[PDB]
PDB file of C-alpha atoms in Angstrom:
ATOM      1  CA  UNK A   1       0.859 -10.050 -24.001  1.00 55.73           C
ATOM      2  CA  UNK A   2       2.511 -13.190 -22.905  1.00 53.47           C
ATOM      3  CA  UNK A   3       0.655 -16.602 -21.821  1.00 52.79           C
ATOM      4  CA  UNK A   4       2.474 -18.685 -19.183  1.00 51.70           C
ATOM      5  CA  UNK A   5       0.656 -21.374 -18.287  1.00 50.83           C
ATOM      6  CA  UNK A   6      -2.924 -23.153 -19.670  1.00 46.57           C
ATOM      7  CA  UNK A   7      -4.471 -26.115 -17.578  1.00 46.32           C
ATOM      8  CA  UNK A   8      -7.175 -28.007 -20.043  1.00 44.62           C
ATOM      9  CA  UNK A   9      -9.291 -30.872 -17.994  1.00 46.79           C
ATOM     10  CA  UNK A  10     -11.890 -32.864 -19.882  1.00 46.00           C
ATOM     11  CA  UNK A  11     -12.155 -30.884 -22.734  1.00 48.12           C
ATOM     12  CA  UNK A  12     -12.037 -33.218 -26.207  1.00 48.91           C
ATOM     13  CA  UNK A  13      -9.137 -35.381 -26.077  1.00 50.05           C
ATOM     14  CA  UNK A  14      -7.697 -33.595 -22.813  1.00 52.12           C
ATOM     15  CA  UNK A  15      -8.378 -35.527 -19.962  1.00 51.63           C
ATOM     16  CA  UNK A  16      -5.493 -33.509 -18.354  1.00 53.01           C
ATOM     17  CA  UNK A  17      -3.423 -31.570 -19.786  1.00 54.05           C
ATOM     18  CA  UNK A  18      -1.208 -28.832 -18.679  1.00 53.42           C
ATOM     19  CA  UNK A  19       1.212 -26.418 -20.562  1.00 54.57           C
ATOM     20  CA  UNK A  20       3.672 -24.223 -19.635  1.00 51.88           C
ATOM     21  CA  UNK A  21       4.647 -21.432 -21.970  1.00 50.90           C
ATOM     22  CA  UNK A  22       7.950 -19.844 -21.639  1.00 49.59           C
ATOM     23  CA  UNK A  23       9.876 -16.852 -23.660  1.00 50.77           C
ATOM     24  CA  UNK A  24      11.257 -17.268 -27.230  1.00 50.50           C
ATOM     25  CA  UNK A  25       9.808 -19.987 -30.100  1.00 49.53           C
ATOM     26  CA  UNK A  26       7.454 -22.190 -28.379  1.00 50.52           C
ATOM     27  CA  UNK A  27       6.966 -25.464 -30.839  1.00 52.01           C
ATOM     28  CA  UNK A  28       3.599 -27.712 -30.128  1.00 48.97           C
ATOM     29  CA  UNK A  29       4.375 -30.551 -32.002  1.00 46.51           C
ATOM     30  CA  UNK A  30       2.266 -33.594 -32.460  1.00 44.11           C
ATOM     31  CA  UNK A  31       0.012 -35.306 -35.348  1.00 45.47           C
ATOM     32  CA  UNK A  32      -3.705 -34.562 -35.960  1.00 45.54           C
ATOM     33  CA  UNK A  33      -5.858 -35.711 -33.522  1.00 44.63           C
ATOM     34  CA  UNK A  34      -2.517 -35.410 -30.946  1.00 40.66           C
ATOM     35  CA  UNK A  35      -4.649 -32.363 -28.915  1.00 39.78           C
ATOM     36  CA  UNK A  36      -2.915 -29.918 -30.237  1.00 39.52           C
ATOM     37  CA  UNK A  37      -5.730 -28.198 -32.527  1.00 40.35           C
ATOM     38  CA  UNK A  38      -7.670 -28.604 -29.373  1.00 42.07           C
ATOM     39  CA  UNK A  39      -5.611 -26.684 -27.135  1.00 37.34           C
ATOM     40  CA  UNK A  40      -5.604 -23.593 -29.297  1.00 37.76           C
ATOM     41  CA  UNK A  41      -9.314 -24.154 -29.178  1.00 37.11           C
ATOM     42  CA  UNK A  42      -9.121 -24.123 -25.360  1.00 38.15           C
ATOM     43  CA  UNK A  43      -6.621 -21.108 -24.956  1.00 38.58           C
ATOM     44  CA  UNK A  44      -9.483 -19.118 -27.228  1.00 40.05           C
ATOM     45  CA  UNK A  45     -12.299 -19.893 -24.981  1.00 41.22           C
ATOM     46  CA  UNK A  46      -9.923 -19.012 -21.728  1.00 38.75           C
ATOM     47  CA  UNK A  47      -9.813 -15.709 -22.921  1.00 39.16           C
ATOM     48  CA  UNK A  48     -12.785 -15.135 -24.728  1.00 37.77           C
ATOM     49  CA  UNK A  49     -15.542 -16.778 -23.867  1.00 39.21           C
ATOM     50  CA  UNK A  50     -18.278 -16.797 -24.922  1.00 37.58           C
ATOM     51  CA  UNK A  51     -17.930 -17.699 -28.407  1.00 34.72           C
ATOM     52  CA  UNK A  52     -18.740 -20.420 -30.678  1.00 35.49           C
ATOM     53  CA  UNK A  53     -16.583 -23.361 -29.834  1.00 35.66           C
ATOM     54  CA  UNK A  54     -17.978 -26.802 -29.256  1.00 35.05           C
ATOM     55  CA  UNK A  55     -17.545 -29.440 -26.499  1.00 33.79           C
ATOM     56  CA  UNK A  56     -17.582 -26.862 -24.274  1.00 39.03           C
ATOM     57  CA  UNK A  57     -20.976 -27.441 -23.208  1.00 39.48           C
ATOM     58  CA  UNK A  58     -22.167 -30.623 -22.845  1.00 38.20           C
ATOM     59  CA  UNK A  59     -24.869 -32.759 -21.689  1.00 37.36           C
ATOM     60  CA  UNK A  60     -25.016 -35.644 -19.180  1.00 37.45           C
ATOM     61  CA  UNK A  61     -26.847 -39.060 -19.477  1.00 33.89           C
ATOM     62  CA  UNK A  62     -24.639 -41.594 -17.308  1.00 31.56           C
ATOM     63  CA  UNK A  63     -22.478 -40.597 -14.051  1.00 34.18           C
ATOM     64  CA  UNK A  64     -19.548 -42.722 -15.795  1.00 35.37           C
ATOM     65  CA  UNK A  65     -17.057 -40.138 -17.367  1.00 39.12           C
ATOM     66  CA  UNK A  66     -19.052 -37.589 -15.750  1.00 40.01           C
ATOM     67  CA  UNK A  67     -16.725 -34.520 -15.299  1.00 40.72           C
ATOM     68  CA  UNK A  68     -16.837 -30.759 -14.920  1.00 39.79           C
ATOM     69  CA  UNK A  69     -14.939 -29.047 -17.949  1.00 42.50           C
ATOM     70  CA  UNK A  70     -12.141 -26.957 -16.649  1.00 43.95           C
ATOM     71  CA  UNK A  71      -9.551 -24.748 -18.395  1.00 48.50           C
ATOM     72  CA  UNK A  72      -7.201 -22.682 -16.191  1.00 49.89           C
ATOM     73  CA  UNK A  73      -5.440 -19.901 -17.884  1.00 48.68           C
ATOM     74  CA  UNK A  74      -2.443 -17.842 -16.718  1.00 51.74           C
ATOM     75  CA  UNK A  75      -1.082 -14.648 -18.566  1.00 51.85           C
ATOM     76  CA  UNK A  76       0.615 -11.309 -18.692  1.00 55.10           C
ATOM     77  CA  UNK A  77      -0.438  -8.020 -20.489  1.00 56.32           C
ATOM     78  CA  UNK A  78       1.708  -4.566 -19.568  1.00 58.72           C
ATOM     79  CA  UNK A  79       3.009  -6.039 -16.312  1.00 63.15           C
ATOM     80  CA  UNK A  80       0.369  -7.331 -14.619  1.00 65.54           C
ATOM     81  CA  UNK A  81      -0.436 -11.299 -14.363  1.00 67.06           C
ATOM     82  CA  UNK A  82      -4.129 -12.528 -14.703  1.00 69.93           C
ATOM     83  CA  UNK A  83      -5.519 -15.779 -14.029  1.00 72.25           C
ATOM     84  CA  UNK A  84      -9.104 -16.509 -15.952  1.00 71.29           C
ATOM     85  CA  UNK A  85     -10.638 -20.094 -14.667  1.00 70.58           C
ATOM     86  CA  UNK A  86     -13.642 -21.388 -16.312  1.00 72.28           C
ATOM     87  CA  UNK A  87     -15.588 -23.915 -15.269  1.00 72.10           C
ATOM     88  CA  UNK A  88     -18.866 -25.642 -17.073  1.00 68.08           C
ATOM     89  CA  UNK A  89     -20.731 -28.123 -15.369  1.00 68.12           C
ATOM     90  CA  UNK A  90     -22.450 -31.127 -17.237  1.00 68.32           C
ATOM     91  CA  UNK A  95     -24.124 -24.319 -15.323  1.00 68.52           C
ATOM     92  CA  UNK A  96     -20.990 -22.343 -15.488  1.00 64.00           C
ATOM     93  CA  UNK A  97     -18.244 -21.071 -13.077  1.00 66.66           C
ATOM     94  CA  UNK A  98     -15.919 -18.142 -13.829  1.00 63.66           C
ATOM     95  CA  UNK A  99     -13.362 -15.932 -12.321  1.00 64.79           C
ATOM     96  CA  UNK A 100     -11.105 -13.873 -13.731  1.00 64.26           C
ATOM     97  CA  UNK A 101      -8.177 -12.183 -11.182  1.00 64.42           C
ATOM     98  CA  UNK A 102      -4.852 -10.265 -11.217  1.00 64.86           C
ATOM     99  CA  UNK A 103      -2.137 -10.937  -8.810  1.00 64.35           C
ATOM    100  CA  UNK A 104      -1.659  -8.407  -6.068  1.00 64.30           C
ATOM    101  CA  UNK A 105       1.132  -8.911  -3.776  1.00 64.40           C
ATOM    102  CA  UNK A 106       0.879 -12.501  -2.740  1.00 62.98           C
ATOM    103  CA  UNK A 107      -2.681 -12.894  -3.511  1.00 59.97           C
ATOM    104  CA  UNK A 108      -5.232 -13.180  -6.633  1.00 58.36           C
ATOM    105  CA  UNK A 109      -7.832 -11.101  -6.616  1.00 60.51           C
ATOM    106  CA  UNK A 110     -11.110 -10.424  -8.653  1.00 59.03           C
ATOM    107  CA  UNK A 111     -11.080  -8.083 -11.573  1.00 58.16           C
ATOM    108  CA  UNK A 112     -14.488  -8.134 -11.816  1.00 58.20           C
ATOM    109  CA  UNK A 113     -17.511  -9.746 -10.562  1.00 57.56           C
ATOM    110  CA  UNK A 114     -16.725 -13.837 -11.536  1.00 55.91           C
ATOM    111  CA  UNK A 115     -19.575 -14.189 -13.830  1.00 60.10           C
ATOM    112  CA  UNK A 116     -19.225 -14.798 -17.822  1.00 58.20           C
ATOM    113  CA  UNK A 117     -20.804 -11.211 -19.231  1.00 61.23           C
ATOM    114  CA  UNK A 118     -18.721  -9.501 -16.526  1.00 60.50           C
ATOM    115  CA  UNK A 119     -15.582 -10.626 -17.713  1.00 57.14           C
ATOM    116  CA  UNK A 120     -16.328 -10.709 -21.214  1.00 59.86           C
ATOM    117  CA  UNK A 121     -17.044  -7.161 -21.136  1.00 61.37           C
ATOM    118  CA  UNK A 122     -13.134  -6.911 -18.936  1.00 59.76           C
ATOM    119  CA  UNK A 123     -11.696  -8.775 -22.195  1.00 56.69           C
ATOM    120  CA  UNK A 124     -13.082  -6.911 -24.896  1.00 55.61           C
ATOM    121  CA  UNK A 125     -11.226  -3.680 -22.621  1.00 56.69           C
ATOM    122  CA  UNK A 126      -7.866  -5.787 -22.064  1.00 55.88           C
ATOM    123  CA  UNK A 127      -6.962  -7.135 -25.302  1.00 60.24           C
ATOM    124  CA  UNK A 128     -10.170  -7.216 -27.608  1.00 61.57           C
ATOM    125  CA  UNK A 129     -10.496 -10.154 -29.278  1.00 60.57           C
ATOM    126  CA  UNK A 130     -10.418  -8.696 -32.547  1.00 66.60           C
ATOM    127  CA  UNK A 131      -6.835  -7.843 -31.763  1.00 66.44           C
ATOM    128  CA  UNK A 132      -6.375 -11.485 -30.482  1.00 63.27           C
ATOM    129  CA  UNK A 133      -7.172 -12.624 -33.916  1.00 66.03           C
ATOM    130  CA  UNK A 134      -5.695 -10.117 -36.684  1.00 64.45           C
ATOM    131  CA  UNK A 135      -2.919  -9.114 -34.653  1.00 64.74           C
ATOM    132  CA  UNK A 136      -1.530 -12.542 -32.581  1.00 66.45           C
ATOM    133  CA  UNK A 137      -3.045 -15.275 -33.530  1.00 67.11           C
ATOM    134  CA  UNK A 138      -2.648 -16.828 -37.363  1.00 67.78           C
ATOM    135  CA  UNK A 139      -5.495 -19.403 -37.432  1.00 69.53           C
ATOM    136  CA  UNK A 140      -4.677 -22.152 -40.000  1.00 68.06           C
ATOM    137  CA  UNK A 141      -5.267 -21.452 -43.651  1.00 67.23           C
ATOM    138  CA  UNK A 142      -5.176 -17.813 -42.657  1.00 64.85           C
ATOM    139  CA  UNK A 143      -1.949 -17.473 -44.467  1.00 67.52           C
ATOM    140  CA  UNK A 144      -3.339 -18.896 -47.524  1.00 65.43           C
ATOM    141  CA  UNK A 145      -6.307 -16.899 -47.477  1.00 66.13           C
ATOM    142  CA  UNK A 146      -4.178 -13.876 -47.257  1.00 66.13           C
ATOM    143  CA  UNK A 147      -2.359 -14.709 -50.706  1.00 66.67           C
ATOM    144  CA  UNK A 148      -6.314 -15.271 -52.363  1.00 69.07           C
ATOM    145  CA  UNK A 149      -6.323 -13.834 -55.994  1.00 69.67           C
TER     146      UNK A 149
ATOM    147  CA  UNK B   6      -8.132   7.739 -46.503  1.00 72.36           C
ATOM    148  CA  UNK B   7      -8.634   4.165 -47.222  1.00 72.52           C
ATOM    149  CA  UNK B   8      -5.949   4.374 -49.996  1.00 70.94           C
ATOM    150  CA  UNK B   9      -3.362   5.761 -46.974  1.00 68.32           C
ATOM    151  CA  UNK B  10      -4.387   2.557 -45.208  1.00 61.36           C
ATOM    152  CA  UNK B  11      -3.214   0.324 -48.408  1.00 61.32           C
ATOM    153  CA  UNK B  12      -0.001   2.398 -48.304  1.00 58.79           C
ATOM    154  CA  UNK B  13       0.749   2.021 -44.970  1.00 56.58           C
ATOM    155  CA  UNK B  14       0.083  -1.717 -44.731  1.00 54.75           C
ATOM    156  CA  UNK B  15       2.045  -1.887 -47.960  1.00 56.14           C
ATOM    157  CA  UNK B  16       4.794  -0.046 -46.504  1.00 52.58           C
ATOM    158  CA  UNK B  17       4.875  -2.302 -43.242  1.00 51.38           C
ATOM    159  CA  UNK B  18       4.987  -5.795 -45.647  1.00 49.35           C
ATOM    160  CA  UNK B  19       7.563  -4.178 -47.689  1.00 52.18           C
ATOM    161  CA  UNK B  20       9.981  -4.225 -44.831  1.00 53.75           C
ATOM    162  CA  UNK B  21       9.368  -7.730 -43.211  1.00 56.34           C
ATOM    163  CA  UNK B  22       8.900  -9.807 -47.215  1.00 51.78           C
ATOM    164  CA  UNK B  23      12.470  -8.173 -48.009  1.00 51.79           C
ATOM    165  CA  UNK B  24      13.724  -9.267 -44.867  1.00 51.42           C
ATOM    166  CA  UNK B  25      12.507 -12.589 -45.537  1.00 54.12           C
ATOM    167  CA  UNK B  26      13.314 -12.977 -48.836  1.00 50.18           C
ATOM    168  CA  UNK B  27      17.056 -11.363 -48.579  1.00 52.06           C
ATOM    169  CA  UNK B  28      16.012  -8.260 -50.594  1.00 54.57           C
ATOM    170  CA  UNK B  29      14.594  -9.995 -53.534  1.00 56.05           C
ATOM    171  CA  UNK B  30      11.298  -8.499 -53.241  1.00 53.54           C
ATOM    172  CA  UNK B  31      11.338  -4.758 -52.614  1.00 54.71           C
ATOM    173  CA  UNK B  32       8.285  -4.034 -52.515  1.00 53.88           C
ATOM    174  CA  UNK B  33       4.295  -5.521 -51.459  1.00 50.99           C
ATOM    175  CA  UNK B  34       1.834  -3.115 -52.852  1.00 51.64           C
ATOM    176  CA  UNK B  35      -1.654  -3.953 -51.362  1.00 50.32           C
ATOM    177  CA  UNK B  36      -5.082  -3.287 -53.323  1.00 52.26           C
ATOM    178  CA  UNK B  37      -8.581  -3.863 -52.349  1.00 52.97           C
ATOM    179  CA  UNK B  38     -10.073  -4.974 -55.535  1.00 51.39           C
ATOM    180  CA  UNK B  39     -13.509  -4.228 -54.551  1.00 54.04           C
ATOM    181  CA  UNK B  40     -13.267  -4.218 -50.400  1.00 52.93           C
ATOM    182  CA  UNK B  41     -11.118  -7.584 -50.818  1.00 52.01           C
ATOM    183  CA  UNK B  42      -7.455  -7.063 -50.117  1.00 52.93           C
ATOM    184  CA  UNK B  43      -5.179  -8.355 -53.128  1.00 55.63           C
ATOM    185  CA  UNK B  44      -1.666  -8.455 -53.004  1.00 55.36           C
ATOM    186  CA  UNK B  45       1.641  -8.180 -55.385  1.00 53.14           C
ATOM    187  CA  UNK B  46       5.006  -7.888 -55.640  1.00 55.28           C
ATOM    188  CA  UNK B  47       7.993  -5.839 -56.859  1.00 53.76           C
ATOM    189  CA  UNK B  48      10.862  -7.749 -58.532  1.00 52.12           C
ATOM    190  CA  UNK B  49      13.564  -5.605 -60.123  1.00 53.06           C
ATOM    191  CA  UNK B  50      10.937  -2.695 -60.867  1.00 51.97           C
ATOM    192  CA  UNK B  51       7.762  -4.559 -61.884  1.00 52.35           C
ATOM    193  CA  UNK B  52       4.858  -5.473 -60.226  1.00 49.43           C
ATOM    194  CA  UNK B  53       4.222  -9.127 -60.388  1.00 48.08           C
ATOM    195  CA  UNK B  54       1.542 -11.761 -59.691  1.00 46.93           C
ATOM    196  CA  UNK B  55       1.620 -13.872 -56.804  1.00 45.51           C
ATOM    197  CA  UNK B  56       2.050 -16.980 -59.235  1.00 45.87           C
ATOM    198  CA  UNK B  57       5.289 -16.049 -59.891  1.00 47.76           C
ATOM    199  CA  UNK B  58       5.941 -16.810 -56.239  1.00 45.73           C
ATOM    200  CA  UNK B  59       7.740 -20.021 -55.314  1.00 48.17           C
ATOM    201  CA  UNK B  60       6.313 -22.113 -52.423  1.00 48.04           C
ATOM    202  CA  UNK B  61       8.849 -20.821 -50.006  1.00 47.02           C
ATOM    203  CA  UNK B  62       8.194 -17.339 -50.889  1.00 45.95           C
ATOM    204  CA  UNK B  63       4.615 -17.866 -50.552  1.00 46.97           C
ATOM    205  CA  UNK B  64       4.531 -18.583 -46.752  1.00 45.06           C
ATOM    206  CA  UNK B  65       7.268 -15.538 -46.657  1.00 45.00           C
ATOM    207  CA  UNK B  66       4.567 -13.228 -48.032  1.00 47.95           C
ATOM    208  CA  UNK B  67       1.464 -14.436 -45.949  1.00 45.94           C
ATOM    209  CA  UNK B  68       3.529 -14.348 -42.552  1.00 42.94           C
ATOM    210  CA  UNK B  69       5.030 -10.987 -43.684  1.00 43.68           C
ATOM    211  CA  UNK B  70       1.178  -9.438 -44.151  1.00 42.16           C
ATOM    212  CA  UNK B  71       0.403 -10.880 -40.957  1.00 42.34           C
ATOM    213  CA  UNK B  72       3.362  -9.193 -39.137  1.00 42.60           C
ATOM    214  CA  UNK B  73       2.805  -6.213 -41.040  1.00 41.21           C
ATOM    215  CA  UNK B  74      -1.018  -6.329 -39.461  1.00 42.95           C
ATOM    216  CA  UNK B  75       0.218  -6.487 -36.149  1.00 42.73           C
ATOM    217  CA  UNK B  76       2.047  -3.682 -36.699  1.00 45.09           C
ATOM    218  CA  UNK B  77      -0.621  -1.594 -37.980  1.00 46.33           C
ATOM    219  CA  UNK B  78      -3.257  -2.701 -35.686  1.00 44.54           C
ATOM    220  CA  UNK B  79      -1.375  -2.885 -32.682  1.00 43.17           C
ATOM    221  CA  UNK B  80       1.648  -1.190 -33.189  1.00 43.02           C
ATOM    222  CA  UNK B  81       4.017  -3.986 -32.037  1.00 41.42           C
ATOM    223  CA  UNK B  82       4.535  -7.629 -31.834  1.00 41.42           C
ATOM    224  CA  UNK B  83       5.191  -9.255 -28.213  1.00 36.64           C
ATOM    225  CA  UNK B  84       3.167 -12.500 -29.209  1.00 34.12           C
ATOM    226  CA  UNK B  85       2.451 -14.471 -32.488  1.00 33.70           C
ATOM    227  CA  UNK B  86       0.828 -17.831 -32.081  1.00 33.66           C
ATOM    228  CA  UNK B  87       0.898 -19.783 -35.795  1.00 31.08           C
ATOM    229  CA  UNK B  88      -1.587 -23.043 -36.151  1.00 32.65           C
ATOM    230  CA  UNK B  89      -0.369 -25.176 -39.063  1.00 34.82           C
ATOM    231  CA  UNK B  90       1.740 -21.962 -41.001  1.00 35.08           C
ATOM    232  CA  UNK B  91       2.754 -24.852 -43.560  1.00 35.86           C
ATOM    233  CA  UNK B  92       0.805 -27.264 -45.227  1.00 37.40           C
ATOM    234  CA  UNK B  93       1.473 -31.285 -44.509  1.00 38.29           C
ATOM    235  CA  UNK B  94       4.617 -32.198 -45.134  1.00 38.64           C
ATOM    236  CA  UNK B  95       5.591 -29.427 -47.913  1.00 39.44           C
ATOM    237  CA  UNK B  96       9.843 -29.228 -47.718  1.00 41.67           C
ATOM    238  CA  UNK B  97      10.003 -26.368 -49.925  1.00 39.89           C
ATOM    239  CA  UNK B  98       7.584 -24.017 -47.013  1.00 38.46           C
ATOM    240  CA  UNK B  99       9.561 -26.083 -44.468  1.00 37.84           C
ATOM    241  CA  UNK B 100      12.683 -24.519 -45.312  1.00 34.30           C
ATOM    242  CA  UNK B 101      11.713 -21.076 -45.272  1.00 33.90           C
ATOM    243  CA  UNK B 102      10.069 -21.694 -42.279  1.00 33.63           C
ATOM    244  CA  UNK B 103      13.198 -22.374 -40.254  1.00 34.12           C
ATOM    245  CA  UNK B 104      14.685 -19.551 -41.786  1.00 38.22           C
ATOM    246  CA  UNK B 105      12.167 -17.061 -40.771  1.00 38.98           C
ATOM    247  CA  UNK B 106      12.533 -18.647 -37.150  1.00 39.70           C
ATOM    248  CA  UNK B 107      16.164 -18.257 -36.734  1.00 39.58           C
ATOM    249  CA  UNK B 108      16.334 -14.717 -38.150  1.00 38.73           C
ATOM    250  CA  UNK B 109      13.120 -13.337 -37.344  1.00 39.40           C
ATOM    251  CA  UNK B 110      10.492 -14.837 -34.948  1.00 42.90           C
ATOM    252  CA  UNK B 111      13.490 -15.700 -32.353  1.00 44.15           C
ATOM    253  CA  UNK B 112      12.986 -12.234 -31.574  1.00 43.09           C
ATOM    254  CA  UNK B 113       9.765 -11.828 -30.600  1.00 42.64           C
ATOM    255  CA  UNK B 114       8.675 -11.984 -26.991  1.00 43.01           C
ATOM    256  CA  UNK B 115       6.792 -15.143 -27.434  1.00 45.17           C
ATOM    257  CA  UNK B 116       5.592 -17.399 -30.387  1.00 46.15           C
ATOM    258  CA  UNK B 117       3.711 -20.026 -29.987  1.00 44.54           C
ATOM    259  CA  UNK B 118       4.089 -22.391 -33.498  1.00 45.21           C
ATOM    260  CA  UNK B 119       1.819 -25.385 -34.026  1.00 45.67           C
ATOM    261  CA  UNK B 120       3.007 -27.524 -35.945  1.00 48.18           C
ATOM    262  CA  UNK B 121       3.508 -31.509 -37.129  1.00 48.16           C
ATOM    263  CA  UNK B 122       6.636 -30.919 -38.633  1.00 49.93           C
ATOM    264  CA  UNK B 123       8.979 -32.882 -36.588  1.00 47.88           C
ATOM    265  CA  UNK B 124      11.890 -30.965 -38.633  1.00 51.70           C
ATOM    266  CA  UNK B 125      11.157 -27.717 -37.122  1.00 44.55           C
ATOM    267  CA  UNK B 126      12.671 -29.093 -33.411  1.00 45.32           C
ATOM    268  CA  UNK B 127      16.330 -27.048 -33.797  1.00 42.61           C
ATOM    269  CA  UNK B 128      15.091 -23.653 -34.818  1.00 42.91           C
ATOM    270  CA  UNK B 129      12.775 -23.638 -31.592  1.00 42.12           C
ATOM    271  CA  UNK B 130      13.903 -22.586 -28.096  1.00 43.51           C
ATOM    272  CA  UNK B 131      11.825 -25.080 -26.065  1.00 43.69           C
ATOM    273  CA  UNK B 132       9.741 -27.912 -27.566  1.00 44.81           C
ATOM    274  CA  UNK B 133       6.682 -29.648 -26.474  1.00 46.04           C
ATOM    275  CA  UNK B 134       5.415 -32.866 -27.858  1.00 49.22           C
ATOM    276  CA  UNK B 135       1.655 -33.757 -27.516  1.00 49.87           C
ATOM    277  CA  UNK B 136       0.083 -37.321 -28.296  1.00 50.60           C
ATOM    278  CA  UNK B 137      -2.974 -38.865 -28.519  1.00 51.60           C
ATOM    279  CA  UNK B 138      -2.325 -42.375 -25.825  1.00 50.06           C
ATOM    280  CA  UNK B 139      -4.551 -43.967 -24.888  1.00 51.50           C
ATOM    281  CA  UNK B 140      -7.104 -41.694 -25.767  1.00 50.98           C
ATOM    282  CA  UNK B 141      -6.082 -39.000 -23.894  1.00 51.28           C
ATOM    283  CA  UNK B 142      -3.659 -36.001 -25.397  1.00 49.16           C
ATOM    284  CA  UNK B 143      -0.316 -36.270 -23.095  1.00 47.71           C
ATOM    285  CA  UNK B 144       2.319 -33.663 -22.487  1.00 44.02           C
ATOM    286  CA  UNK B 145       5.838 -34.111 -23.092  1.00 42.60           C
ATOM    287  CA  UNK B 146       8.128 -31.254 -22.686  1.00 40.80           C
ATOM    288  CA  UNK B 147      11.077 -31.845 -24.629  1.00 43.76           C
ATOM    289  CA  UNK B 148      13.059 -28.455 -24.039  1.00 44.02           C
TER     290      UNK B 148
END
């Protein structure tokens, strides 16, 4: 599995934010409260949402700041590159396509259980966490005695 | 059967903690004390507590049980992503850190470290800065 490229718009602190991921050591640096927690965060709910991760949805009492919250993610498993784009409205939007030739198309129907279901096939999220991803303080719990 | 799973995992830690620590530590031998997975280590023959561990070879051991978990559950390692391996501002896990990335996580695929340390910059292969300005999180590749 390799990520390439996460787009994060007005989610927490990211108004904006894009990242491209390239091969070898990949350092986010920055100071609490910088984003970075944030876009871990954001990368998780790309791939697996649902789950339990807040600010994602959101209610709406003013039109000021009033934005859809968008994360775009692009990745690679076994030679194939898929593109998951989630959108939640302040009701939800979601695709989640493979490139084919020139063109992205669906893998399944866009809709949330359909591509959960997709996910938990691809690269379960149990192997996402105890296999890839070292959540912080994970090390520390490891070494518990 | 579970006790071939201990082995196994054991085995697997073995490898990467000696790697890390230069052959120090021959051995991790994983228990479940009670379905709660304890670990210890081999020093010239003997089994020893973790407390015996010095800060550097602390982060050593938990990053080489979480490689060796890759390993076992998925049977390779093309992606690690680490949030925060160290905690703020310790030099001693700093060190070891930049070790482990020059001789060992520069081959992997892809890793994806999180980190404050500032430090860490010349044992990466690209960099990326992100800061809070204005109140917005802003993107700055550095390499």
């Amino acid at each position: 599995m390799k990520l390439e490229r996460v787009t994060v718009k007005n989610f927490r602190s990211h108004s904006d934010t894009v990242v491209e991921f390239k091969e070898g050591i990949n350092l986010i640096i920055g100071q609490n409260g910088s984003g970075k927690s944030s876009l871990l965060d954001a990368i998780l709910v790309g791939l697996y949402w649902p789950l339990r991760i807040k600010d994602i949805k959101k209610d709406e009492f003013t039109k000021v700041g009033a934005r859809d919250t968008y994360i775009d993610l692009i990745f690679e498993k076994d030679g194939t590159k898929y593109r998951i784009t989630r959108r939640f409205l302040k009701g939800e939007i979601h695709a989640m396509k493979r490139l084919v030739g020139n063109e992205w198309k669906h893998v399944t129907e866009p809709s949330s259980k359909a591509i959960s279901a997709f996910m938990e096939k691809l690269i379960p999220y149990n192997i996402f966490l105890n296999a890839i991803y070292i959540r912080q303080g994970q090390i520390d719990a490891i070494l518990e005695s | 059967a579970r006790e071939a799973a201990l082995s196994k995992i054991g085995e697997l830690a073995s490898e990467i903690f000696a790697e890390f620590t230069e052959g120090k530590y021959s051995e991790v031998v994983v228990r479940a004390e009670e379905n709660k997975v304890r670990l210890f280590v081999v020093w010239e023959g003997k089994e020893r507590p973790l407390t015996f561990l010095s800060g550097g070879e602390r982060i050593a051991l938990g990053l080489a049980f979480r490689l060796a978990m890759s390993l076992y559950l998925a049977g390779e390692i093309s992606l690690l992503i680490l949030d925060e391996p160290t905690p703020y501002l310790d030099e001693e896990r700093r060190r070891k850190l930049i070790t482990i990335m020059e001789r060992y996580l520069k081959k992997i695929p892809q890793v994806i470290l999180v980190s404050h340390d500032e430090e860490l910059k010349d044992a990466a292969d690209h960099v990326i800065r992100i800061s809070l300005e204005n109140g917005s999180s802003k993107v700055e590749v550095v390499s």
